[PDB]
Amino acid sequence: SILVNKNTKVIVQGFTGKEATFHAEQCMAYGTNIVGGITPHKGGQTHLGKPVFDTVADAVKATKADVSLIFVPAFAVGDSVIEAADAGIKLAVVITEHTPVKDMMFAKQYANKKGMKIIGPNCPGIITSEECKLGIMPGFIFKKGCVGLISKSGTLTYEAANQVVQGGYGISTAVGIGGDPIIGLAYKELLSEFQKDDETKAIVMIGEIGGSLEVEAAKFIKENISKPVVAFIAGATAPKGKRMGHAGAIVGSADESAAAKKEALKSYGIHVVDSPALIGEEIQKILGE
Amino acid sequence: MNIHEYQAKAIFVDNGIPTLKGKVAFSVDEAVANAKELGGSVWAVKAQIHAGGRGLGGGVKIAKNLDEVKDYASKILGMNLVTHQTGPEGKLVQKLYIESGANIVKEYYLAILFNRMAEQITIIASSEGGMDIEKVAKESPEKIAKVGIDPQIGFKMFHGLEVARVLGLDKDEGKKLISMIAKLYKLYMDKDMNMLEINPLIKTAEGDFYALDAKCSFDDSALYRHPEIAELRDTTEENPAEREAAEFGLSYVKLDGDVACMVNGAGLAMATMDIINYSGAKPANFLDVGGGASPETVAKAFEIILRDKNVKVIFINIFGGIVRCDRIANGILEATKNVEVNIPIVVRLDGTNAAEAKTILDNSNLKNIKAATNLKNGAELVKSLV
Ligand SMILES: [Cl-]
């Protein structure tokens, strides 16, 4: 597993909101050590049996959590990421979609300076199979195994995970890195974590149209990652210059296209899958029956 | 979201950015009155559509007297303006911009835009105003300055001096342009823009800089905090079905193809389009609908998808994770009530209670609903029905 486990202490920003409450409860039932949460003007209350704080700084002082799970609305995301970084959070998992790009641009520069890593925004979060989950993913799909998962999507990640479990294997940790044009941790950082994780024997990377992270990852894999990598890049059939749901999913130039990414990955030895139905099968080819 | 030239220029005026005098006109009489009010002896009469290439298309005419204004406005207002950017169908011109004619001695390219790979802003300038910037970059890179602006510091004089060099500007000209660029950068940041393109930026014989055209694109995610930008929307310039879908919580894009799709999550929706292509058919659309959507929302999604009478099959591909597949199945059955459709619907539901969901769909005995559980089998069934 990487980054998180059953002991990781987690605070929730936007803890008393309806959606956040629903997911926080499911995360706790799955084993996540949620120690508290933030909602301005509700400091001193109790919620899902844990303390509520007005500020991340108060929560960190009381609980010593260094991981935050962020459910606040889009208009609050940038300031909530900055708040987390200011208080000494080391990893912020940001679920919310529709964050203004500029807010994310400035919040990431501040997070970088303070040494806080981000997962997201516009992502389902991170899960370590049968240990903990931080986000909105269906816990029971993730059966423990030796396959790492890095994905710019939500449901397609579950589809891939399920194919791997049905194919006789399982997931170590799965990370949704987000569908926005600016995100936090991505392929290079997470592939390096997985390469150092003895429980992981292979990695599935799921990408999509827009920017060139997956092209740059290809050479990086060749030079640094000796564990096998399977890639599926969504959007081969996407029209150019059109947003395909995700703010980040838009082909502006030829190197942002799915074909350009698949071709780069293929030429550097990555196992590239054309049909999204056959990700599990690719893992079986690699690891055996 | 994009805006018209006249709307960009009113924003410029509201922010102290130098602009030629001009005013929008909704009728021929309004165009003439505008010219009268502006004065001088030269007025550009310009079609206002979002698409570029209006000049070559015949949408820009320079009037030398008020009869020419009247004549030109009559010819342009109501025309179907075809440009390289509209494609062959063209676009109905419903408004004009009337602008004082300048004495142009130079034309430059200037844009401010987001650099995704560097997570910062780029200022692009070229001496080759009016030309295609991608062709100039490819053919003659020395005629382009591409300047990386770290938003931590913003646009600085030293960045400007690089732009001034490539535009061949002297000291005083450079200072005047750089002052304008600083205002344009501030506006770009203040309004959550993602593209501000001036092609061409003109230098006048009197030594002034103006935008002869302006294309501004705004971050759709930030429109909630810029009501004065949101109100500029021109729905005649946007796709009606995409906009209608978004009102019902759906993301839709129309393609040309024979297999419609209905999927939860943008990634899986793209992957669904991809597997249809891999199976030897053609996706007719992208559609992302939440697995938790109400049967009303699902019913609207069916309505929108089925407008395309080339569609031969609907492929519903939904992964119920947090949402139970059996409840998704019940909603699909509710949403198909009283619908009169001869094309088959392949329904691939997987995840939570997938087996129960398939049982519900099989038990309905609606034989043109074809339930599958695995993605590969789903796609093969779609392919056999085409
Ligand atoms: Cl997604």
Q: Tokens 């260094």 label which residue?
A: A66
What is the dihedral sign for C-alpha A5, A10, A16, A17? Answer: negative
Alpha-carbon distance of B384 to A285, in angstroms, equals 27
What is the dihedral sign for C-alpha A78, A84, A88, A91? Answer: negative
Domain A1-122 has CATH 3.40.50.720: yes
Which candidate from A136, A140, A234 shows the least CB-CB separation from B267?
A: A234
Name every residue whose Cβ is closer than 8 Å to that of residue B9 and which is 6 or more positions away in sequence. Answer: B19, B20, B22, B97, B211, B214
To the nearest whole Å, the CA of B224 is away from the closest chain A CA by 9
Phi, psi of A150 (to 5 degrees): -125, 125
Using CA atoms, how far residue A253 sits from A260, B51, B74, B180, in Å, is 10, 19, 39, 29
Resolution number, Å:
2.1
How many of the other CB atoms lie within 10 Å of CB of A288?
Answer: 8
Q: Cβ–Cβ of A242/B266 closer than 8 Å?
A: no
Which candidate from B192, B224, B266 shows the least CB-CB separation from A102?
A: B192
Contact predicate A76/A104, CB 8 Å = no
- Which two tokens mark A134? 């931080």
Q: Cβ–Cβ of B321/A108 closer than 8 Å?
A: no
Q: Cβ–Cβ of A153/B268 closer than 8 Å?
A: yes
- Strands across the sheet with A271-272, in order? A132-135, A125-128, A171-176, A144-151, A202-208, A229-234, A271-272
User: How far, in Å, is the centroid of ligand 1 from the Cα of A174?
Assistant: 14
Cα A190-B221-B6 angle, rounded to 5 deg: 135
- Which two tokens mark B373? 């559980």
Residue B274 with chain A: CB contacts under 8 Å: 234-237, 258, 275-276
Name every residue whose Cβ is closer than 8 Å to that of residue A18 and which is 6 or more positions away in sequence. Answer: none
Residue A136 with chain B: CB contacts under 8 Å: 322
Q: Where in chain A is the domain with CATH 3.40.50.720?
A: 1-122
Alpha-carbon distance of A25 to B290, in angstroms, equals 21
Q: Which residues of A217-249 are buried (b: 16+ CB within 10 A; e: fewer)?
A: bbeebeeebebbbbbbbbbbbbeeebbbbbbbb
To the nearest whole Å, the CA of B102 is away from the closest chain A CA by 34
How many of the other CB atoms lie within 10 Å of CB of B236?
Answer: 12
In a 3-state reduction of DSSP, which class is residue B294?
coil
Name every residue whose Cβ is closer than 8 Å to that of residue B14 and which is 6 or more positions away in sequence. Answer: none
To the nearest whole Å, the CA of B374 is away from the closest chain A CA by 8
- How far the first Cα of chain A sits from its last, in Å, is 23
Enumerate domains of chain B plus CATH numbers: 1-20+105-239 (3.30.470.20), 21-104 (3.30.1490.20), 240-386 (3.40.50.261)
Contact predicate B244/B234, CB 8 Å = no
In a 3-state reduction of DSSP, which class is residue A139?
helix
- How far the first Cα of chain B sits from its last, in Å, is 37
Helix B28-38 / helix B66-76 crossing angle, nearest 10 deg: 140
How many of the other CB atoms lie within 10 Å of CB of B247?
Answer: 8
What is the dihedral sign for C-alpha B91, B97, B98, B104? Answer: negative
- The one catalytic residue in A23, A47, A246, A271 is A246
Q: Cβ–Cβ of A236/B274 closer than 8 Å?
A: yes
Which candidate from B114, B286, B351 shows the least CB-CB separation from A138?
A: B351
* Strand partners for A132: A128
The DSSP call for residue B306 is: T
Q: Tokens 């209905």 label which residue?
A: B262
- Which two tokens mark B214? 């302006």
A99 touching B, CB under 8 A? Answer: yes
Alpha-carbon distance of B382 to B386, in angstroms, equals 6
Which candidate from B221, B274, B319 shows the least CB-CB separation from A100?
A: B221
Alpha-carbon distance of A243 to B76, in angstroms, equals 32
Contact predicate B165/B145, CB 8 Å = yes
Please give the CATH superfamily to which domain A123-289 belongs.
Answer: Succinyl-CoA synthetase domains (3.40.50.261)
Q: Cβ–Cβ of A100/B152 closer than 8 Å?
A: no
- Which two tokens mark B25? 């006109």
Which stretches does DSSP call E strand in A113-167? 117-119, 125-128, 132-135, 144-151
Alpha-carbon distance of B90 to B84, in angstroms, equals 9
B197 is a catalytic site residue: yes
Contact predicate A253/A241, CB 8 Å = no
For β-strands A33-38 and A50-53, DSSP reports them as parallel
Alpha-carbon distance of B276 to B380, in angstroms, equals 9
* Strand partners for B107: B202
Find how far residue A12's CA is from the centre of its chain.
Answer: 16
The stretches of chain B forming alpha helices (DSSP H) are 5-14, 28-38, 54-57, 66-76, 133-139, 157-166, 171-190, 227-230, 240-247, 266-278, 295-305, 325-335, 354-363, 375-385
Contact predicate B48/B93, CB 8 Å = yes
Contact predicate A245/B266, CB 8 Å = yes
How many of the other CB atoms lie within 10 Å of CB of A115?
Answer: 10
How many of the other CB atoms lie within 10 Å of CB of A113?
Answer: 10
The one-letter code for the residue type at B184 is L
Alpha-carbon distance of A276 to B36, in angstroms, equals 64
The one-letter code for the residue type at B10 is A
DSSP annotation string for B336-374: TTT----S-EEEEEEETTHHHHHHHHHHTT-TTEEEESS
Q: Tokens 């991340």 label which residue?
A: A56
- Rounded to 10 degrees, what is the CA torsion of A108, A109, A114, A119? 20
Using CA atoms, how far residue A84 sits from A13, A185, A251, in Å, is 9, 16, 33
Residue pairs spanning A and B at CB distance below 8 A: 152
A61: phi > 0 → left, psi -120 to 50 → alpha, else beta; which?
Answer: alpha
Using CA atoms, how far residue B103 sits from B42, B58, B212, B305, in Å, is 10, 21, 12, 52
Q: Cβ–Cβ of B274/A182 closer than 8 Å?
A: no
**Please, which experimental method was used?**
X-ray
Q: Which residue of A has its CA nearest to B290?
A: A155
> Side-chain half-sphere of B254: how many Cα atoms within 13 Å?
17
Helix (H) or strand (E) holding B206: none
Alpha-carbon distance of B124 to B114, in angstroms, equals 11
Alpha-carbon distance of B180 to B177, in angstroms, equals 5
The verdict on whether residue B233 carries a ligand-binding annotation is no
Phi, psi of A151 (to 5 degrees): -145, 135
